Design a binder for this molecule. Structure first.
Ligand SMILES: Nc1ncnc2c1ncn2[C@@H]1O[C@H](COP(=O)(O)OP(=O)(O)NP(=O)(O)O)[C@@H](O)[C@H]1O
Ligand SMILES: Nc1ncnc2c1ncn2[C@@H]1O[C@H](COP(=O)(O)OP(=O)(O)NP(=O)(O)O)[C@@H](O)[C@H]1O
Lengths: 281, 278
């Protein structure tokens, strides 16, 4: 059927603090998200024969393990159980994938968010933003931020989101070459897990930092190298659990100038921060 | 009122439906309380001081869920102008539940502290708010806060009341402590059990997706289950190490308890669908 095109932007954690750990191992976080005007593009063609096909498998991820497919299947389940899924609802999905796996840019969660929002719209299920954010939290920690579509402060177990208006700066984002899946960092015994809970105003007045950065820097020489390079030019930090690091600039020209200083083995891009997700249109 | 109950729970079933990229597992699980647990003494203070008078063996006081619960409530209430100046408390616990056993004792302690201090200080937080705070403390805190046997979904915040039969249980602790992350990191753990309706789940055989892993990895759990299975339906609760056996009368449960090896340290308690806390 029709071929629809849907943005899946990256995010940055402008700061990220680990305030505690539950007995089941889950870490409570206080973190501030901003989107980038940069990321993946999904093409979604709806179907009436009930089939769900990923036309562009992502290397390193079996099909049924792709968050694209998991998101579609979860929406189908939730909508069907509430009598909101038309019979034969299906989709063919392809992705122009720019965001790396294990990058800390939230590519997987962003893909899931876009698929939830796009298929809910196309199939006409009528699920609210609240309902899609509740589904999204089951798929990925940051799916709710992408679903709701606003730069936001996230606490609780990731479901408490408050809109914030951080400066829409220009960022140089580097991929230091290695992939660091979040569990590799969150299982580290030396990870900080006792940063004090702070109000949003207090956090906005703190020195922005990422509690994962010291661990990633020490465990991965590639992250240390990328951070050492960018820090010669601008405030620079890890995003997510890495491996990606970013540097902040006041202008596009300055960011692209510093990107030009990048060693050839350090892939990077320049993108502006945006507080409204392209997905929200 | 200064004496507050903190009941145990059982997971009557437990299914693992998925795992996120950050390692977190989504569950579908059924909770019932036991008429058995800890008793907390909570004595309000007007000097803004908060103290745990009784340490829990092995737990640094600042890591104790009792203290974490009190300090989280103080923060959330203060930030919304609902904490009277000088609010404090002296808290003690008579701990009868074991740790790392799957009875939810730590989450129950946190729930009791949240509900008790909210009431004693008069902060006026709603049950919804306390259950939202509780999710930051422990995975099962919201079930203990709301106080009803319940089917729990989502990331543990979607709770549906259910009325499972209030049976008598023989709860056995095979002595070995199995912290949940040890089970949740196992490559062989089932992580893709289909999500199913409560009505579906209420009419299938109850099971615990953690049981097979727990039995294979821990001989004390394997031996504890092999004994109880002779006499009654028996399953792991939580991620273990505790196991429970299902009886229709107290006398039958107790007669099996009297045949238990000393290393089992078992107790008998009735299931209740309404928390003593409520
Ligand atoms: N369509 C997808 N795009 C990217 N990653 C995917 C996708 N589908 C499954 N994954 C996997 O799940 C993760 C995507 O979740 P995501 O929100 O992007 O977190 P991340 O910041 O990229 N890295 P991490 O959380 O440490 O795994 C990746 O690591 C993939 O292994
Ligand atoms: N007041 C407390 N009572 C019991 N445990 C506590 C307490 N405070 C901190 N803890 C610790 O945090 C955990 C409490 O979580 P708990 O509710 O007991 O889960 P469980 O179902 O019993 N099994 P597990 O998740 O492995 O701990 C315990 O393992 C303790 O080490």
């Amino acid at each position: 059927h029709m071929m629809t095109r849907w943005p899946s932007p990256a995010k940055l954690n402008l700061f990220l603090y680990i305030t505690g750990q539950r007995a089941d191992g889950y870490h409570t976080l206080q973190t501030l998200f901003q989107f980038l005007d940069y990321g993946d593009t999904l093409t979604i063609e709806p179907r009436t024969d009930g089939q769900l096909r990923l036309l562009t498998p992502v290397a390193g991820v079996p099909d049924e393990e792709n968050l694209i497919v998991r998101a579609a299947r979860l929406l189908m389940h939730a909508a069907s159980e509430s009598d909101r899924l038309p019979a034969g609802s299906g989709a063919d999905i392809s992705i122009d994938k720019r965001l790396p796996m294990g990058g800390g840019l939230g590519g997987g969660s962003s893909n899931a968010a876009t698929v939830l929002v796009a298929l809910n719209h196309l199939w006409g299920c009528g699920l609210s933003e609240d309902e899609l954010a509740t589904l999204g939290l089951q798929l990925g920690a940051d799916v709710p931020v992408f679903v709701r579509g606003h730069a936001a402060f996230a606490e609780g177990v990731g479901e408490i989101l408050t809109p914030v208006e951080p400066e829409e700066k220009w960022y140089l984002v580097a991929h230091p070459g290695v992939s660091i899946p979040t569990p590799i960092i969150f299982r580290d015994p030396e990870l900080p897990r006792n940063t004090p809970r702070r109000s949003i105003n207090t956090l906005l007045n703190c020195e922005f930092s990422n509690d994962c950065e010291l661990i990633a820097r020490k465990r991965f020489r590639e992250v240390d190298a990328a951070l050492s390079w960018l820090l010669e030019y601008a405030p620079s930090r890890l995003t997510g659990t890495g491996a990606c690091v970013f540097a902040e600039f006041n202008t596009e020209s300055a960011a692209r100038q510093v990107l030009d200083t990048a060693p050839a083995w350090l892939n990077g891009f320049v993108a502006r921060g945006v507080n409204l997700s392209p997905l929200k249109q």
